Design a protein around this ligand. Structure first.
Ligand SMILES: [Hg+2]
Length: 204
């Protein structure tokens, strides 16, 4: 029930990366592909720097023209719907809880329980979650692996569930996952707040 280990490792894997992160998310939030030169202009960075940082992010999604379309927040369909009239998507459940505070917008999030397929939805603002349906919604966490593909090693195991017991039944069948944990969606949101408050201090 102690979540510092997840906060610590998430920052490790994820993280001038932090300097690039927030501006990229806010761009992607406009609903369109982001070029390296647009990104570079926004940051006041030389192009080599932007490229170097992106090269460390192996899960980064690109379109036909090689522009950024996915980086946590994505234009390519996933199980995690992230609506701000735009319909965007997130790589994992925790992403949906973190992004709103970083982009300064409230988001309507929806998905399906990973154990049962039941619909789940909530509204996530920079400071709280609301309209949590179902109320007992849960989230799975694993410990990020430091040098691994973040989307495969972390994001693909970080789901919403209709309930904490339902989530725990599911977790009981999923060994092999490092540091697998079930928390309430409210606890997951608190984790995301901690993550952000730290991340922001790392920024220049
Ligand atoms: Hg993720």
């Amino acid at each position: 029930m102690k979540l510092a280990p997840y906060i610590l490792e998430l920052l490790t894997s994820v993280n001038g990366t932090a300097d690039l992160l927030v501006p990229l998310l806010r761009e992607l939030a406009k609903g369109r592909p982001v070029s390296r030169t647009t990104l570079a202009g926004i940051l006041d960075w030389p192009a080599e720097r932007v490229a170097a940082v992106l090269e460390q992010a192996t899960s980064t999604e690109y379109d036909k023209d090689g522009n950024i379309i996915g980086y946590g927040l994505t234009l390519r369909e996933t199980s995690y719907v992230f609506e701000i009239d735009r319909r965007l998507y997130a790589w994992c459940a925790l992403d949906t809880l973190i992004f709103p505070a970083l982009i300064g917008r409230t988001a309507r999030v929806s998905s399906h329980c990973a154990a049962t397929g039941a619909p789940v939805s909530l509204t996530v603002s920079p400071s709280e979650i609301q309209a949590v349906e179902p109320a007992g919604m849960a989230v799975s966490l694993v410990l990020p692996q430091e040098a691994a593909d973040v989307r495969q090693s972390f994001c693909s195991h970080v789901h919403f569930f209709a309930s904490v017991p339902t989530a725990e039944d599911w977790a009981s069948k999923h060994q092999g996952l490092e540091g697998l944990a079930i928390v309430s969606v409210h606890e997951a949101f608190g984790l995301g707040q901690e993550f952000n408050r730290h991340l922001l201090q790392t920024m220049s």
